[PDB]
Design a binder for this molecule. Structure first.
Ligand SMILES: Cc1cc2nc3c(=O)[nH]c(=O)nc-3n(C[C@H](O)[C@H](O)[C@H](O)COP(=O)(O)OP(=O)(O)OC[C@H]3O[C@@H](n4cnc5c(N)ncnc54)[C@H](O)[C@@H]3O)c2cc1C
Ligand SMILES: *[C@@H]1O[C@H](CO)[C@@H](O)[C@H](O)[C@H]1NC(C)=O
Ligand SMILES: [Cl-]
Length: 467
Protein backbone atom coordinates (compact mmCIF):
# COMPACT_ATOMS: atom_id res chain seq x y z
CA UNK A 1 0.00 0.00 0.00
CA UNK A 2 2.93 2.37 0.88
CA UNK A 3 6.60 1.57 0.35
CA UNK A 4 8.43 -0.47 -2.31
CA UNK A 5 6.32 -1.93 -5.08
CA UNK A 6 6.88 -5.45 -6.46
CA UNK A 7 5.37 -6.99 -9.58
CA UNK A 8 5.07 -10.77 -9.43
CA UNK A 9 4.88 -12.36 -12.88
CA UNK A 10 2.78 -15.53 -12.58
CA UNK A 11 0.51 -16.99 -9.90
CA UNK A 12 1.45 -20.67 -9.81
CA UNK A 13 2.82 -22.20 -6.60
CA UNK A 14 6.03 -20.11 -6.51
CA UNK A 15 4.42 -16.76 -7.39
CA UNK A 16 1.77 -17.25 -4.70
CA UNK A 17 4.41 -18.53 -2.28
CA UNK A 18 6.62 -15.49 -2.93
CA UNK A 19 3.88 -12.85 -2.65
CA UNK A 20 2.81 -14.44 0.66
CA UNK A 21 6.32 -14.17 2.04
CA UNK A 22 6.63 -10.56 0.79
CA UNK A 23 3.31 -9.69 2.40
CA UNK A 24 4.42 -11.20 5.70
CA UNK A 25 7.54 -9.00 5.64
CA UNK A 26 5.34 -5.95 5.22
CA UNK A 27 5.88 -5.58 1.46
CA UNK A 28 2.18 -5.42 0.61
CA UNK A 29 2.24 -3.29 -2.54
CA UNK A 30 2.13 -6.32 -4.74
CA UNK A 31 0.72 -6.76 -8.19
CA UNK A 32 0.39 -10.36 -9.37
CA UNK A 33 0.00 -10.64 -13.17
CA UNK A 34 -1.14 -14.16 -14.20
CA UNK A 35 -1.18 -15.12 -17.91
CA UNK A 36 -4.06 -17.63 -17.71
CA UNK A 37 -7.55 -17.13 -16.18
CA UNK A 38 -6.73 -18.85 -12.86
CA UNK A 39 -4.04 -19.31 -10.23
CA UNK A 40 -2.27 -22.64 -9.62
CA UNK A 41 -0.04 -22.99 -12.68
CA UNK A 42 1.21 -26.54 -13.16
CA UNK A 43 -1.09 -27.69 -10.39
CA UNK A 44 -4.27 -27.97 -12.39
CA UNK A 45 -7.27 -30.31 -12.40
CA UNK A 46 -9.67 -31.02 -15.26
CA UNK A 47 -12.91 -32.85 -15.88
CA UNK A 48 -12.33 -36.25 -17.48
CA UNK A 49 -15.35 -38.37 -18.30
CA UNK A 50 -17.29 -37.03 -15.28
CA UNK A 51 -14.52 -36.99 -12.68
CA UNK A 52 -11.75 -34.60 -11.75
CA UNK A 53 -8.21 -35.69 -12.61
CA UNK A 54 -4.91 -33.79 -12.46
CA UNK A 55 -3.40 -32.48 -15.71
CA UNK A 56 -0.20 -31.47 -13.93
CA UNK A 57 1.19 -32.47 -10.53
CA UNK A 58 -0.49 -35.45 -8.94
CA UNK A 59 1.76 -36.64 -6.04
CA UNK A 60 3.02 -35.19 -2.81
CA UNK A 61 6.55 -36.59 -3.25
CA UNK A 62 8.74 -37.18 -0.21
CA UNK A 63 6.72 -38.09 2.88
CA UNK A 64 7.57 -40.02 6.11
CA UNK A 65 11.28 -39.13 6.34
CA UNK A 66 13.54 -37.27 8.75
CA UNK A 67 12.26 -33.81 7.77
CA UNK A 68 8.72 -32.52 7.18
CA UNK A 69 7.85 -31.77 3.56
CA UNK A 70 6.11 -28.36 3.78
CA UNK A 71 3.44 -29.40 1.26
CA UNK A 72 2.42 -32.47 3.27
CA UNK A 73 0.94 -30.84 6.40
CA UNK A 74 -1.15 -28.63 4.07
CA UNK A 75 -2.47 -31.60 2.06
CA UNK A 76 -2.98 -34.16 4.82
CA UNK A 77 -4.03 -32.04 7.85
CA UNK A 78 -5.14 -28.52 6.90
CA UNK A 79 -7.16 -29.23 3.77
CA UNK A 80 -7.44 -33.00 4.27
CA UNK A 81 -7.22 -33.70 0.54
CA UNK A 82 -8.08 -37.29 -0.38
CA UNK A 83 -4.78 -39.12 -0.99
CA UNK A 84 -3.22 -42.60 -1.24
CA UNK A 85 0.34 -43.83 -0.68
CA UNK A 86 1.75 -45.35 -3.85
CA UNK A 87 3.08 -48.88 -3.39
CA UNK A 88 5.67 -50.03 -5.94
CA UNK A 89 6.54 -53.30 -4.18
CA UNK A 90 4.82 -55.55 -6.73
CA UNK A 91 6.12 -54.31 -10.07
CA UNK A 92 7.83 -57.69 -10.67
CA UNK A 93 4.39 -59.30 -10.91
CA UNK A 94 3.24 -56.68 -13.39
CA UNK A 95 5.63 -56.45 -16.33
CA UNK A 96 4.03 -57.23 -19.69
CA UNK A 97 5.79 -58.72 -22.71
CA UNK A 98 5.62 -56.73 -25.90
CA UNK A 99 3.54 -59.68 -27.33
CA UNK A 100 2.07 -62.17 -24.95
CA UNK A 101 1.39 -61.37 -21.35
CA UNK A 102 3.41 -60.98 -18.17
CA UNK A 103 6.93 -62.07 -17.38
CA UNK A 104 7.75 -64.49 -14.61
CA UNK A 105 7.72 -62.60 -11.29
CA UNK A 106 10.99 -64.28 -10.33
CA UNK A 107 12.74 -63.25 -13.55
CA UNK A 108 11.76 -59.56 -13.30
CA UNK A 109 12.67 -59.39 -9.61
CA UNK A 110 16.29 -60.25 -10.49
CA UNK A 111 16.45 -57.53 -13.15
CA UNK A 112 14.92 -55.05 -10.66
CA UNK A 113 17.33 -56.01 -7.84
CA UNK A 114 20.16 -55.75 -10.40
CA UNK A 115 19.14 -52.22 -11.40
CA UNK A 116 18.69 -51.26 -7.74
CA UNK A 117 22.24 -52.28 -6.88
CA UNK A 118 23.74 -50.43 -9.85
CA UNK A 119 21.91 -47.35 -8.53
CA UNK A 120 23.14 -47.94 -4.99
CA UNK A 121 26.67 -48.16 -6.44
CA UNK A 122 25.81 -44.85 -8.12
CA UNK A 123 24.73 -43.31 -4.82
CA UNK A 124 28.08 -44.21 -3.21
CA UNK A 125 29.99 -42.75 -6.18
CA UNK A 126 27.90 -39.57 -6.01
CA UNK A 127 28.70 -39.08 -2.31
CA UNK A 128 32.42 -38.88 -3.18
CA UNK A 129 32.29 -36.33 -6.04
CA UNK A 130 33.59 -32.77 -5.51
CA UNK A 131 31.09 -29.98 -4.75
CA UNK A 132 32.27 -28.10 -7.85
CA UNK A 133 30.79 -30.89 -10.04
CA UNK A 134 34.22 -31.15 -11.74
CA UNK A 135 34.08 -34.97 -11.75
CA UNK A 136 30.31 -35.46 -12.31
CA UNK A 137 28.85 -37.69 -15.02
CA UNK A 138 25.54 -38.78 -16.55
CA UNK A 139 23.46 -41.47 -14.84
CA UNK A 140 24.22 -43.59 -17.93
CA UNK A 141 28.03 -43.20 -17.58
CA UNK A 142 27.77 -44.38 -14.00
CA UNK A 143 25.69 -47.33 -15.25
CA UNK A 144 28.28 -48.16 -17.93
CA UNK A 145 31.03 -48.07 -15.30
CA UNK A 146 29.25 -50.56 -13.00
CA UNK A 147 27.95 -52.84 -15.77
CA UNK A 148 31.28 -52.91 -17.72
CA UNK A 149 29.40 -52.21 -20.97
CA UNK A 150 29.52 -49.59 -23.71
CA UNK A 151 25.79 -49.10 -23.07
CA UNK A 152 23.11 -48.94 -20.33
CA UNK A 153 20.04 -51.24 -20.02
CA UNK A 154 19.39 -52.24 -23.65
CA UNK A 155 16.85 -55.03 -23.36
CA UNK A 156 13.04 -54.77 -23.38
CA UNK A 157 12.56 -55.67 -19.66
CA UNK A 158 15.74 -53.92 -18.48
CA UNK A 159 14.89 -50.73 -20.35
CA UNK A 160 11.36 -50.39 -18.98
CA UNK A 161 12.79 -51.03 -15.51
CA UNK A 162 15.38 -48.34 -16.35
CA UNK A 163 12.64 -46.09 -17.70
CA UNK A 164 10.54 -46.68 -14.57
CA UNK A 165 13.40 -45.84 -12.22
CA UNK A 166 14.64 -42.74 -14.01
CA UNK A 167 12.58 -41.42 -16.95
CA UNK A 168 9.34 -41.86 -14.97
CA UNK A 169 10.85 -39.67 -12.23
CA UNK A 170 12.83 -37.06 -14.18
CA UNK A 171 11.10 -37.11 -17.62
CA UNK A 172 14.40 -37.44 -19.55
CA UNK A 173 16.68 -40.48 -20.18
CA UNK A 174 19.50 -41.26 -17.66
CA UNK A 175 21.77 -40.39 -20.61
CA UNK A 176 21.18 -36.64 -20.15
CA UNK A 177 20.65 -36.47 -16.39
CA UNK A 178 23.33 -35.43 -13.88
CA UNK A 179 24.33 -38.20 -11.46
CA UNK A 180 25.60 -35.91 -8.74
CA UNK A 181 22.34 -33.97 -8.67
CA UNK A 182 19.70 -36.68 -8.97
CA UNK A 183 21.25 -39.79 -7.38
CA UNK A 184 20.40 -39.75 -4.57
CA UNK A 185 17.59 -37.21 -4.70
CA UNK A 186 17.45 -34.61 -1.94
CA UNK A 187 13.61 -34.82 -2.06
CA UNK A 188 13.68 -38.46 -0.89
CA UNK A 189 16.80 -38.17 1.27
CA UNK A 190 15.31 -35.24 3.21
CA UNK A 191 11.54 -35.75 3.27
CA UNK A 192 11.26 -39.57 2.87
CA UNK A 193 10.82 -42.28 0.23
CA UNK A 194 7.01 -42.30 0.19
CA UNK A 195 4.84 -40.59 -2.39
CA UNK A 196 1.11 -39.87 -2.03
CA UNK A 197 -1.35 -39.70 -4.92
CA UNK A 198 -3.69 -36.74 -4.50
CA UNK A 199 -7.15 -37.85 -5.62
CA UNK A 200 -9.57 -35.17 -4.39
CA UNK A 201 -12.24 -33.42 -6.48
CA UNK A 202 -11.04 -30.07 -5.11
CA UNK A 203 -7.73 -30.54 -6.93
CA UNK A 204 -4.13 -30.56 -5.72
CA UNK A 205 -4.38 -26.85 -6.70
CA UNK A 206 -6.31 -26.37 -3.41
CA UNK A 207 -2.88 -25.93 -1.81
CA UNK A 208 -2.21 -22.88 -3.96
CA UNK A 209 -5.72 -21.50 -3.39
CA UNK A 210 -5.34 -21.99 0.34
CA UNK A 211 -1.95 -20.23 0.47
CA UNK A 212 -3.37 -17.46 -1.73
CA UNK A 213 -6.31 -16.84 0.59
CA UNK A 214 -3.98 -16.26 3.52
CA UNK A 215 -3.08 -12.79 2.31
CA UNK A 216 -5.35 -11.95 -0.64
CA UNK A 217 -8.93 -10.62 -0.21
CA UNK A 218 -11.58 -13.26 -0.85
CA UNK A 219 -15.34 -12.91 -0.98
CA UNK A 220 -17.03 -13.80 2.35
CA UNK A 221 -19.87 -15.62 0.67
CA UNK A 222 -18.26 -16.89 -2.52
CA UNK A 223 -14.70 -17.68 -1.43
CA UNK A 224 -13.25 -16.46 -4.73
CA UNK A 225 -10.19 -14.21 -4.58
CA UNK A 226 -11.40 -10.67 -5.21
CA UNK A 227 -8.16 -8.90 -4.44
CA UNK A 228 -7.38 -6.13 -6.95
CA UNK A 229 -3.70 -7.05 -6.46
CA UNK A 230 -4.27 -10.33 -8.36
CA UNK A 231 -4.79 -9.76 -12.14
CA UNK A 232 -5.77 -12.73 -14.32
CA UNK A 233 -5.41 -12.98 -18.12
CA UNK A 234 -2.37 -10.72 -17.96
CA UNK A 235 0.36 -11.96 -20.27
CA UNK A 236 3.67 -10.27 -19.52
CA UNK A 237 5.60 -9.63 -22.73
CA UNK A 238 8.29 -7.08 -21.90
CA UNK A 239 10.36 -6.30 -18.83
CA UNK A 240 12.43 -3.10 -18.77
CA UNK A 241 14.93 -2.82 -15.93
CA UNK A 242 17.13 0.07 -14.88
CA UNK A 243 19.31 0.72 -11.86
CA UNK A 244 16.41 3.03 -10.87
CA UNK A 245 13.33 0.80 -11.28
CA UNK A 246 11.36 -1.54 -13.54
CA UNK A 247 8.65 -1.48 -16.16
CA UNK A 248 6.42 -4.44 -17.06
CA UNK A 249 4.28 -4.39 -20.23
CA UNK A 250 1.47 -6.91 -20.80
CA UNK A 251 0.09 -8.21 -24.12
CA UNK A 252 -3.02 -6.00 -23.96
CA UNK A 253 -0.57 -3.06 -23.92
CA UNK A 254 -0.74 -2.06 -20.19
CA UNK A 255 2.55 -0.81 -18.71
CA UNK A 256 3.27 -1.03 -14.96
CA UNK A 257 6.01 0.57 -12.90
CA UNK A 258 7.63 -1.12 -9.89
CA UNK A 259 10.72 -1.08 -7.71
CA UNK A 260 11.22 -4.83 -8.34
CA UNK A 261 9.88 -7.72 -10.42
CA UNK A 262 9.64 -11.36 -9.40
CA UNK A 263 9.63 -13.63 -12.49
CA UNK A 264 7.97 -16.98 -11.68
CA UNK A 265 7.41 -18.32 -15.23
CA UNK A 266 8.82 -21.78 -15.96
CA UNK A 267 12.29 -22.42 -17.35
CA UNK A 268 10.51 -23.25 -20.62
CA UNK A 269 8.85 -19.81 -20.86
CA UNK A 270 12.25 -18.27 -20.09
CA UNK A 271 13.73 -20.37 -22.89
CA UNK A 272 11.02 -19.08 -25.31
CA UNK A 273 10.63 -15.55 -26.65
CA UNK A 274 7.43 -14.89 -24.65
CA UNK A 275 9.06 -12.38 -22.32
CA UNK A 276 11.45 -9.82 -23.77
CA UNK A 277 14.06 -8.30 -21.41
CA UNK A 278 15.29 -4.76 -22.13
CA UNK A 279 18.17 -4.60 -21.89
CA UNK A 280 18.83 -8.25 -22.82
CA UNK A 281 19.93 -10.49 -19.92
CA UNK A 282 23.72 -10.87 -19.56
CA UNK A 283 25.50 -13.77 -21.27
CA UNK A 284 26.18 -15.57 -17.99
CA UNK A 285 22.43 -15.57 -17.25
CA UNK A 286 21.47 -16.52 -20.81
CA UNK A 287 23.81 -19.55 -20.97
CA UNK A 288 22.48 -20.68 -17.60
CA UNK A 289 18.89 -20.47 -18.91
CA UNK A 290 19.52 -22.47 -22.12
CA UNK A 291 21.72 -25.15 -20.56
CA UNK A 292 19.16 -26.41 -18.05
CA UNK A 293 16.46 -28.78 -19.34
CA UNK A 294 12.73 -28.21 -19.30
CA UNK A 295 11.38 -31.77 -19.51
CA UNK A 296 7.96 -33.01 -20.69
CA UNK A 297 5.76 -35.46 -18.76
CA UNK A 298 2.52 -36.51 -20.46
CA UNK A 299 -0.25 -38.08 -18.40
CA UNK A 300 -2.47 -39.75 -21.00
CA UNK A 301 -5.86 -40.66 -19.51
CA UNK A 302 -8.24 -43.20 -21.04
CA UNK A 303 -11.91 -44.14 -20.43
CA UNK A 304 -13.35 -47.63 -21.14
CA UNK A 305 -16.91 -49.19 -21.39
CA UNK A 306 -15.79 -52.14 -19.22
CA UNK A 307 -12.53 -53.05 -17.44
CA UNK A 308 -10.17 -55.79 -18.72
CA UNK A 309 -7.07 -55.39 -16.56
CA UNK A 310 -6.10 -56.97 -13.23
CA UNK A 311 -7.17 -55.43 -9.90
CA UNK A 312 -6.35 -56.11 -6.27
CA UNK A 313 -3.08 -56.30 -4.31
CA UNK A 314 -0.09 -54.81 -6.20
CA UNK A 315 -2.04 -54.10 -9.45
CA UNK A 316 -2.03 -50.28 -9.46
CA UNK A 317 1.18 -49.87 -11.46
CA UNK A 318 2.24 -52.05 -14.37
CA UNK A 319 4.80 -51.84 -17.13
CA UNK A 320 4.95 -52.63 -20.84
CA UNK A 321 8.37 -53.82 -21.97
CA UNK A 322 8.33 -52.51 -25.54
CA UNK A 323 11.34 -53.17 -27.73
CA UNK A 324 11.05 -49.44 -28.40
CA UNK A 325 12.38 -47.63 -25.33
CA UNK A 326 9.80 -45.46 -23.54
CA UNK A 327 6.90 -46.50 -25.76
CA UNK A 328 3.70 -46.49 -23.64
CA UNK A 329 5.58 -48.16 -20.82
CA UNK A 330 4.25 -47.02 -17.42
CA UNK A 331 0.60 -47.72 -16.60
CA UNK A 332 -1.62 -46.88 -13.68
CA UNK A 333 -5.09 -48.11 -12.71
CA UNK A 334 -7.42 -46.40 -10.25
CA UNK A 335 -9.43 -49.03 -8.38
CA UNK A 336 -8.71 -47.07 -5.16
CA UNK A 337 -8.81 -43.50 -6.44
CA UNK A 338 -11.73 -43.57 -8.88
CA UNK A 339 -13.53 -46.83 -8.08
CA UNK A 340 -15.94 -47.88 -10.82
CA UNK A 341 -14.58 -45.31 -13.29
CA UNK A 342 -12.81 -47.53 -15.84
CA UNK A 343 -9.84 -45.22 -16.33
CA UNK A 344 -6.25 -46.08 -17.20
CA UNK A 345 -3.25 -43.78 -17.05
CA UNK A 346 -0.30 -44.26 -19.35
CA UNK A 347 2.67 -41.88 -18.96
CA UNK A 348 5.16 -40.86 -21.68
CA UNK A 349 8.04 -38.38 -21.60
CA UNK A 350 10.64 -36.54 -23.64
CA UNK A 351 10.77 -37.61 -27.26
CA UNK A 352 7.48 -39.43 -27.16
CA UNK A 353 5.73 -36.54 -25.53
CA UNK A 354 6.73 -34.14 -28.28
CA UNK A 355 5.67 -36.62 -30.99
CA UNK A 356 2.41 -37.42 -29.23
CA UNK A 357 1.46 -33.76 -28.45
CA UNK A 358 1.78 -33.01 -32.14
CA UNK A 359 -0.44 -35.90 -33.33
CA UNK A 360 -4.22 -36.28 -33.32
CA UNK A 361 -5.87 -37.72 -30.22
CA UNK A 362 -7.47 -40.44 -32.40
CA UNK A 363 -4.14 -41.70 -33.73
CA UNK A 364 -2.76 -41.73 -30.17
CA UNK A 365 -5.69 -43.81 -28.98
CA UNK A 366 -5.20 -46.18 -31.94
CA UNK A 367 -1.57 -46.75 -30.87
CA UNK A 368 -2.62 -47.25 -27.24
CA UNK A 369 -5.33 -49.73 -28.23
CA UNK A 370 -2.86 -51.75 -30.26
CA UNK A 371 -0.56 -51.90 -27.22
CA UNK A 372 -3.40 -52.82 -24.83
CA UNK A 373 -4.53 -55.67 -27.09
CA UNK A 374 -1.00 -57.11 -27.12
CA UNK A 375 -0.87 -56.86 -23.31
CA UNK A 376 -4.23 -58.59 -22.82
CA UNK A 377 -4.80 -60.94 -25.74
CA UNK A 378 -7.89 -63.13 -25.30
CA UNK A 379 -9.49 -60.55 -23.06
CA UNK A 380 -12.03 -58.65 -25.18
CA UNK A 381 -10.64 -55.12 -24.88
CA UNK A 382 -13.04 -52.32 -25.95
CA UNK A 383 -12.00 -49.09 -27.67
CA UNK A 384 -11.51 -46.22 -25.24
CA UNK A 385 -14.67 -44.08 -25.01
CA UNK A 386 -12.54 -41.05 -24.29
CA UNK A 387 -8.90 -39.86 -24.28
CA UNK A 388 -7.03 -37.02 -22.54
CA UNK A 389 -3.61 -35.87 -23.81
CA UNK A 390 -2.23 -32.90 -21.75
CA UNK A 391 -0.21 -30.65 -24.03
CA UNK A 392 2.02 -28.73 -21.60
CA UNK A 393 4.93 -28.47 -24.00
CA UNK A 394 2.75 -26.94 -26.73
CA UNK A 395 1.32 -24.37 -24.30
CA UNK A 396 3.11 -21.00 -24.50
CA UNK A 397 2.69 -20.37 -20.77
CA UNK A 398 4.50 -23.58 -19.75
CA UNK A 399 6.51 -25.06 -22.66
CA UNK A 400 7.10 -28.22 -20.60
CA UNK A 401 6.19 -29.79 -17.27
CA UNK A 402 9.28 -29.38 -15.03
CA UNK A 403 13.05 -28.81 -15.11
CA UNK A 404 15.66 -31.59 -15.08
CA UNK A 405 19.30 -31.23 -14.06
CA UNK A 406 21.40 -32.12 -17.13
CA UNK A 407 25.01 -33.37 -17.28
CA UNK A 408 27.53 -30.56 -17.60
CA UNK A 409 25.62 -28.25 -15.27
CA UNK A 410 27.41 -27.67 -11.96
CA UNK A 411 26.17 -26.03 -8.77
CA UNK A 412 27.64 -22.63 -9.68
CA UNK A 413 25.89 -22.62 -13.05
CA UNK A 414 22.59 -23.65 -11.43
CA UNK A 415 23.01 -20.77 -8.99
CA UNK A 416 23.38 -18.36 -11.93
CA UNK A 417 19.90 -19.49 -13.05
CA UNK A 418 18.45 -18.29 -9.75
CA UNK A 419 20.54 -15.12 -9.37
CA UNK A 420 18.75 -11.80 -9.73
CA UNK A 421 19.66 -9.37 -12.51
CA UNK A 422 19.41 -5.83 -11.14
CA UNK A 423 15.84 -5.31 -9.97
CA UNK A 424 14.71 -8.48 -11.80
CA UNK A 425 14.41 -11.46 -9.44
CA UNK A 426 13.76 -15.09 -10.35
CA UNK A 427 11.65 -17.79 -8.72
CA UNK A 428 10.03 -21.14 -9.64
CA UNK A 429 10.81 -24.83 -9.15
CA UNK A 430 13.79 -24.32 -11.49
CA UNK A 431 15.33 -21.99 -8.90
CA UNK A 432 14.84 -24.44 -5.98
CA UNK A 433 18.16 -25.11 -4.21
CA UNK A 434 17.76 -28.88 -3.74
CA UNK A 435 14.18 -29.54 -4.91
CA UNK A 436 13.90 -28.48 -8.56
CA UNK A 437 11.03 -30.23 -10.41
CA UNK A 438 8.58 -30.47 -7.48
CA UNK A 439 5.58 -28.73 -5.87
CA UNK A 440 7.51 -28.33 -2.61
CA UNK A 441 10.50 -27.04 -4.61
CA UNK A 442 8.35 -24.31 -6.14
CA UNK A 443 6.84 -23.55 -2.72
CA UNK A 444 10.20 -23.24 -0.98
CA UNK A 445 11.64 -21.29 -3.94
CA UNK A 446 9.02 -18.54 -3.61
CA UNK A 447 10.07 -18.10 0.03
CA UNK A 448 13.80 -18.06 -0.82
CA UNK A 449 13.46 -15.58 -3.70
CA UNK A 450 11.16 -13.30 -1.69
CA UNK A 451 13.69 -13.23 1.13
CA UNK A 452 16.55 -12.23 -1.19
CA UNK A 453 14.51 -9.26 -2.29
CA UNK A 454 13.29 -8.34 1.18
CA UNK A 455 16.95 -8.24 2.06
CA UNK A 456 17.37 -5.62 -0.60
CA UNK A 457 14.35 -3.46 -0.08
CA UNK A 458 14.55 -3.39 3.69
CA UNK A 459 18.11 -4.29 4.59
CA UNK A 460 19.73 -2.72 1.55
CA UNK A 461 21.87 -5.77 0.83
CA UNK A 462 21.68 -5.90 -2.93
CA UNK A 463 24.80 -7.46 -4.45
CA UNK A 464 23.93 -11.14 -4.67
CA UNK A 465 26.93 -13.52 -4.59
CA UNK A 466 26.68 -16.49 -6.98
CA UNK A 467 28.03 -19.74 -5.48
C1 LIG B 1 2.35 -32.92 -15.78
C2 LIG B 1 3.07 -32.52 -14.53
C3 LIG B 1 3.40 -33.51 -13.60
C4 LIG B 1 4.11 -33.19 -12.44
N1 LIG B 1 4.09 -34.07 -11.36
C5 LIG B 1 4.53 -33.67 -10.11
C6 LIG B 1 4.07 -34.32 -8.94
O1 LIG B 1 3.33 -35.30 -9.02
N2 LIG B 1 4.47 -33.85 -7.70
C7 LIG B 1 5.24 -32.70 -7.60
O2 LIG B 1 5.83 -32.44 -6.55
N3 LIG B 1 5.63 -32.04 -8.74
C8 LIG B 1 5.18 -32.44 -9.98
N4 LIG B 1 5.14 -31.53 -11.02
C9 LIG B 1 5.98 -30.30 -10.88
C10 LIG B 1 5.21 -29.16 -10.20
O3 LIG B 1 3.89 -29.10 -10.68
C11 LIG B 1 5.93 -27.86 -10.50
O4 LIG B 1 7.28 -28.00 -10.10
C12 LIG B 1 5.38 -26.62 -9.80
O5 LIG B 1 3.99 -26.64 -9.69
C13 LIG B 1 5.76 -25.42 -10.64
O6 LIG B 1 5.26 -24.25 -10.03
P1 LIG B 1 5.95 -22.84 -10.40
O7 LIG B 1 5.36 -21.76 -9.53
O8 LIG B 1 7.46 -22.92 -10.31
O9 LIG B 1 5.62 -22.67 -11.97
P2 LIG B 1 4.14 -22.52 -12.60
O10 LIG B 1 3.13 -23.44 -11.94
O11 LIG B 1 4.28 -22.81 -14.08
O12 LIG B 1 3.76 -20.96 -12.33
C14 LIG B 1 4.09 -19.94 -13.24
C15 LIG B 1 2.84 -19.17 -13.65
O13 LIG B 1 3.18 -18.08 -14.49
C16 LIG B 1 2.20 -17.95 -15.51
N5 LIG B 1 2.81 -17.34 -16.69
C17 LIG B 1 3.77 -17.89 -17.49
N6 LIG B 1 4.15 -16.95 -18.38
C18 LIG B 1 3.69 -15.75 -17.97
C19 LIG B 1 3.66 -14.49 -18.58
N7 LIG B 1 4.52 -14.14 -19.53
N8 LIG B 1 2.85 -13.51 -18.04
C20 LIG B 1 2.25 -13.72 -16.80
N9 LIG B 1 2.21 -14.98 -16.24
C21 LIG B 1 2.90 -15.99 -16.84
C22 LIG B 1 1.72 -19.36 -15.78
O14 LIG B 1 0.38 -19.38 -16.23
C23 LIG B 1 1.84 -20.01 -14.42
O15 LIG B 1 0.59 -19.94 -13.78
C24 LIG B 1 4.60 -31.89 -12.26
C25 LIG B 1 4.39 -30.94 -13.27
C26 LIG B 1 3.54 -31.22 -14.34
C27 LIG B 1 3.00 -30.07 -15.14
C1 LIG C 1 -2.53 -38.43 7.03
O1 LIG C 1 -3.81 -38.30 7.62
C2 LIG C 1 -4.37 -39.48 8.18
C3 LIG C 1 -5.82 -39.24 8.54
O2 LIG C 1 -5.89 -38.06 9.30
C4 LIG C 1 -3.51 -39.89 9.38
O3 LIG C 1 -4.10 -40.92 10.15
C5 LIG C 1 -2.18 -40.31 8.77
O4 LIG C 1 -1.29 -40.68 9.78
C6 LIG C 1 -1.54 -39.21 7.91
N1 LIG C 1 -0.53 -39.80 7.06
C7 LIG C 1 0.74 -39.40 7.12
C8 LIG C 1 1.70 -40.09 6.20
O5 LIG C 1 1.14 -38.52 7.88
CL1 LIG D 1 22.85 -59.94 -16.94
Amino acid sequence: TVGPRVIVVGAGMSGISAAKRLSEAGITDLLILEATDHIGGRMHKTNFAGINVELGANWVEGVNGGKMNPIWPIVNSTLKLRNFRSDFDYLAQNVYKEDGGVYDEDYVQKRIELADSVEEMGEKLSATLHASGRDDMSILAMQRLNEHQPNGPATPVDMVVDYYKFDYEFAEPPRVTSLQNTVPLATFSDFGDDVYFVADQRGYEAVVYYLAGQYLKTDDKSGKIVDPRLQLNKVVREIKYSPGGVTVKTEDNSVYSADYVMVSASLGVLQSDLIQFKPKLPTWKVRAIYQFDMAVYTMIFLKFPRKFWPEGKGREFFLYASSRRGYYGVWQEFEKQYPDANVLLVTVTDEESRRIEQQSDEQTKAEIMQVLRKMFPGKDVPDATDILVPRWWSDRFYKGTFSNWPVGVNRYEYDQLRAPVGRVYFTGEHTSEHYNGYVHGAYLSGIDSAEILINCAQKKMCKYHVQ
